Structure formats: structure tokens, C-alpha cells
Amino acid sequence: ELKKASNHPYLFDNAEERVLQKFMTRENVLRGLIMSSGKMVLLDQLLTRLKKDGHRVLIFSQMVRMLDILGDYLSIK
DNA sequence: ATACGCGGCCGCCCATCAGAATCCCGGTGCCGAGGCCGCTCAATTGGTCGTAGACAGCTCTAGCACCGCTTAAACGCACGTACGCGCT
């Protein structure tokens, strides 16, 4: 569980309400979701850079829950 | 022959001496810690040897985790029958 949580913290239950130190909002949840790990900020910056030109980017992940997390992050954007 | 007197009897309030009954102080029997104790045989003391078992090294099973194709089993709801249970 530490090896799986060594890159993304959102893997348990008491983790989303701990970061949210205020009040349903939508931009604050995604803002607190991207800034929780460096791979999300750098992934969004490189994704925007690739979107400024036009390429087909793929994401290969091992954890099946992280795919759903990306399913909840990329759908809002 | 005819009229007066009275006599113990008695209800009356009023007086004296013993007996009954409550309170002020009590002895008695039962229970449970104490003490005494003493002959003594089981624990303690001082001591040796050796062996279980702690411990560190090691390797080598199996318990975990994880995933996805497949599907039997669980789910929830709709409808009515045949019991739970209440009464007499």
C-alpha cells in the first residue's frame, strides 16, 4: 500500500475531506486534486503543451483505481 | 280509745391505704477474632552439571495482491397463499 501510495495519496477513504479546508464546489476539488501530486501538475502542463500542437497522448498505469481518478479528473476539464 | 315519737336504712360527699404499671437502670448467652503451641516434615539454602532454548543466519514455502474474463449467485420487487397469532 505504501508502494501504491508513493505517487498518489487518494487511495483510501479519509483523504479528500482532509485536503479540503473549506466548503458543493467544483473548481476547488479539482484544484486540490491536481496539486496533491507533482505528476498531476506536470502531466497537465505537458498535456497542455501537447495540446498546443496536436498529438495523441496515452497514459499507461498499473493501478485500476488511478484510471478512475483520471476518469474523474479529465472529464471535468 | 287516739295522737305523738323514732329507729335503723340510706344516698351523699368526703377521708385512708394498698396494689398495679412505667421508667430507670441490667445480667446473660452466643459468636468470632485471638493466643497459644509444638512436634516436624516440607520448603529453603548453598551448590554442581548439563541441557533446553534463546538467538542469530539462512532459505525457501505460501500468503498477498492484483487483474480480467465469465456467470453463477445474490438482489430487489411483485403477488398471493397459507401460516402466525388472537379470540373464544
Side-chain angles (χ1 to χ4, degrees):
Chain A
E1 300 293 337
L2 301 177
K3 301 176 177 59
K4 295 179 60 181
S6 301
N7 49 18
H8 194 71
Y10 295 95
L11 289 178
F12 302 94
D13 299 329
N14 300 120
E16 301 181 0
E17 51 85 20
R18 183 63 60 89
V19 183
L20 299 180
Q21 301 293 339
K22 59 180 180 300
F23 183 81
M24 181 60 60
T25 180
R26 181 180 300 180
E27 185 68 22
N28 300 330
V29 181
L30 189 144
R31 194 268 301 179
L33 180 61
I34 179 182
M35 297 183 180
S36 60
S37 300
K39 298 182 179 180
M40 301 300 300
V41 179
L42 297 179
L43 180 62
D44 181 70
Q45 182 178 0
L46 295 180
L47 177 58
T48 304
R49 176 185 176 183
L50 296 178
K51 278 276 90 184
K52 293 179 61 180
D53 301 330
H55 298 77
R56 302 299 179 90
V57 54
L58 307 189
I59 292 89
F60 289 85
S61 305
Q62 213 293 324
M63 300 62 62
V64 298
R65 307 302 295 270
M66 187 60 180
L67 301 178
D68 300 330
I69 299 178
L70 298 180
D72 302 327
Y73 174 78
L74 300 180
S75 59
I76 304 180
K77 300 297 297 180

